């Protein structure tokens, strides 16, 4: 039970759209339901804009910390030249895959998140210029063994991206859509038998 509230140095829900867990810290269960992209049942902007550069890096702030097994991935979606990013909810497949964190397999597995209440997101250096919806997402493994255990933590920043590139990136994905209650790495019992891999739900990483 954690939230995801800040990016850099901003404060709780400044450049970050208000998740539906602020007060419980709850998550997502139903990888078809619309709070699986923002955790927001209808959309609502955030206050203010997070400025950065492309090939920088975007401080994501997880509160308390993350201490669910289970994987940290990162998304983000770029809002259209005629559009304003405090209406743009990023409906459609916007999506594309910026990070993804492995487990360490043995005896048991071990998650790099574990603990941790800052995390490096890097933002391509060739995606084009522009505001951008920046996702960050934690799934919670520990009663995933069954149909909707798996538990989503999430929450979505708003971005402006100066001096980057003009590469597109391919294979776009939408929330909902782009996970199945089945997928591999969503249904699945961490415990026994012990993975010896693991693949992360959701598309590739992409990269510059
Ligand atoms: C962020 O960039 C915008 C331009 O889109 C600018 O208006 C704003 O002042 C910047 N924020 C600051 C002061 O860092
Ligand atoms: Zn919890």
Known sequence: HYTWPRVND?????????????????????????QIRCFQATPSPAPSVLNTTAGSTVTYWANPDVYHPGPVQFYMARVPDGEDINSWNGDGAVWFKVYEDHPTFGAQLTWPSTGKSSFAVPIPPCIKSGYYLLRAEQIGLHVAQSVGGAQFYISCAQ???????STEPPNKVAFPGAYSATDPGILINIYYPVPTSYQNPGPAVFSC
């Open 10 to 34: 901003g404060a709780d829900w400044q450049q970050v759209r208000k998740a539906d867990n602020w007060q419980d810290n709850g998550y997502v269960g139903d990888v078809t339901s619309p």
């Open 159 to 165: 971005l402006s991206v100066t001096g980057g590139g």
